[PDB]
Amino acid sequence: AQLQNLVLKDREATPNDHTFVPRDIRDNVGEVVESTGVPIGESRFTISLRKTSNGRYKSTLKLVVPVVQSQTVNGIVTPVVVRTSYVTVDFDYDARSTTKERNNFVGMIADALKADKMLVHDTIVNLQGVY
Amino acid sequence: AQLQNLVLKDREATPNDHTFVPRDIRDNVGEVVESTGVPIGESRFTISLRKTSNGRYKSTLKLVVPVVQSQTVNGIVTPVVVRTSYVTVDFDYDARSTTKERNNFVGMIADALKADKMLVHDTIVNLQGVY
Amino acid sequence: AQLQNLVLKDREATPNDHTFVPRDIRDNVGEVVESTGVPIGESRFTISLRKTSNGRYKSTLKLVVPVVQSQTVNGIVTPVVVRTSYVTVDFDYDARSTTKERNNFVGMIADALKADKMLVHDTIVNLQGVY
Amino acid sequence: AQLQNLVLKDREATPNDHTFVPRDIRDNVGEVVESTGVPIGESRFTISLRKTSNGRYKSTLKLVVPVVQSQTVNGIVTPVVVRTSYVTVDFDYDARSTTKERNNFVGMIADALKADKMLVHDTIVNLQGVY
Amino acid sequence: AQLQNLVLKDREATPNDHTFVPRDIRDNVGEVVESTGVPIGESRFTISLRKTSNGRYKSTLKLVVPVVQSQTVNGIVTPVVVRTSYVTVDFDYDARSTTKERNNFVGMIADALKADKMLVHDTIVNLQGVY
Amino acid sequence: AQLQNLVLKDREATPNDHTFVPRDIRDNVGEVVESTGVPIGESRFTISLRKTSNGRYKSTLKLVVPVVQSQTVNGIVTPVVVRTSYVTVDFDYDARSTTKERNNFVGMIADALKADKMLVHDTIVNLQGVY
Ligand SMILES: [Ca+2]
Ligand SMILES: [Ca+2]
């Protein structure tokens, strides 16, 4: 788990590769960043792990992806952030857990984000509730 | 997004299907449950969406998967929970976001959980930190 | 030597020459600027040299390049500074260094700032971290 | 920018290649070294990147080359640093800067350090003041 | 260099390879561990290097090998630590030492820990005094 | 373990045998020396064993080899320690440890110090940090 590049595919027609390049490590918190030429609409992805005192392990993923549009004022073109989207995955394993257990766990909740899993998709994508 | 069945694949040799069946809806919070015959090691998955007052949408996914082993006491065999694993995904979109934006977003962070994405896997699965 | 002109090159397709002319030297800090007739948003380059109490020679270079665009207000077109880029090299030599050592030194640090010097460029130009 | 070899040239008659090799990364600071084995004789190159609190991007280069005469006696060597030279380039960009802009900036100040660029040379190499 | 794998050998009939993998590096203290999927009673090996204010290089190695056996409680088999063995080598070199000196040094101290090196073995292994 | 000769090898092209001979025992600390006659030039190996108050068993090794250039003038020699190197291995076992266990422990950390074991070598010999 050496801070390194992280590539994430999106759900575009023909999936694009978003390449997040490491930036730094503060307080045992890695940060990788997909940056376009201008470092303002840069999307950041952080990751961290810490072992609790009560014998547990807690991982924390954060992904931030802002949207930029060019705002024109008195002829002055300036790229700005019009809105941002945030997500935060939080794991909590028991210090006594086995690798397989953890793997399967991830795998499952991962498979839940899938686009065909209607129950969740119709919520985290199309903003519907449950009924 | 009608409360309904939710099937999640795990990362086993030849992936197993875990079928969570709806249980109820409390305060606009759905709950589906993969239950073995005995309702004690039942794994629960909850989902919810709420529109903030400040014009945002926040989804919240929770997956809980306990592990059960048979504890024998004075000849009395009893299945019990020896440890549990928890995860909590939290989305936060801007009320002005477009479907595509949201979709891609999900898709990306989803693709991050993937098993081959070393940066995160070596952390949320093998409990390594970053360096 | 005497405060005189200073020409710096671009990294533009066909490198443009930026001609800086003397402006003034205050407190033994030479300033030379590249500007059109107007004293606004002119790119400035300052140079200085001082001997330290501890017996060291220490000189300083500072280049400042503001980006100016035309801001139209009620038909009143005025050029204005949209943003600026700063850099400050600091040389500190030993009073016993030979011309060659010093020259070679500069030459190196110089070479380091370069289109192809990967390690460096990717950071001072692409603002990407080291890992 | 993964920590890797960085090679800088002299201004020696027939430019000598100084190959610095990665030593390590510490608190988000890369270090590459042109070493011989003994640490005090090591010429070291440093590099870092930070996103300032107030939204700017700064990166820092630092080169150090010590001069060291090694007295030999009956086969036993005694290295001694007799003088050292230091440089510290400090870039500071605006979060709205273009890749192109930055690049050009660098290239300009780069061009400033240079045998023929008189104004500068006579000072950062010949240690003459400005008048 | 970079925190990577580390394999250590037994002194068992047919020496077994103990493969330690990276876990994390906190406060510039690399840790690499040999463990099964579970984070308990894993043998840990840490390594670090620091430069002293007085101008010395000092690195530290620490190997910890807990002995784990299966503790059956009411049919609930759990692996647990019965006892642990600790060791801490401390190297302190002079900033003017040459690669050879240092290497040779290690090699010696190394040789000292050895099956046949009587004086030493009988004490660090048989816990018998010197007389 | 009766205080006796201890011979350690180099990592020199053709391994040189360093024969330390017993000097003495002081307050339960054995000392063996590779001497030439003059005490400051002596490379000395220390060794001890204690049963900690709280029932543990600790033994300690310490090796020291000074580098000393001896200036000769008209037949009169002037030795001078120009730099020294120190190591301190610290074992700590459990009163319930097996001979076998201990032995293996030693052999493992022993194996750690070693030309090919990269992670370690690059640090305890090449003085590189961990990243
Ligand atoms: Ca319904
Ligand atoms: Ca790293």
Curated annotation (Swiss-Prot), chains A, B, C, D, E, F:
Subunit structure, as described in the record: Homodimer. The capsid proteins form dimers that assemble by group of 5. Twelve such pentamers are linked together with free dimers. The homodimers binds to the viral RNA via an operator hairpin, but also to many other RNA sequences in the viral genome; this interaction probably shifts the virus from the replicative to the assembly phase and ensures specific encapsidation of the viral genome.
A GO-annotated cellular component: T=3 icosahedral viral capsid
Function: Capsid protein self-assembles to form an icosahedral capsid with a T=3 symmetry, about 26 nm in diameter, and consisting of 89 capsid proteins dimers (178 capsid proteins). Involved in viral genome encapsidation through the interaction between a capsid protein dimer and the multiple packaging signals present in the RNA genome. The capsid also contains 1 copy of the A2 maturation protein. Acts as a translational repressor of viral replicase synthesis late in infection. This latter function is the result of capsid protein interaction with an RNA hairpin which contains the replicase ribosome-binding site.
Subcellular location: Virion
Superkingdom as given in the UniProt entry: Viruses
Protein name: Capsid protein
Family (UniProt): Belongs to the Leviviricetes capsid protein family.
Gene Ontology MF terms in the entry: RNA binding; structural molecule activity
InterPro entries listed in its UniProt record: Levivir_coat, Phage_RNA-type_capsid
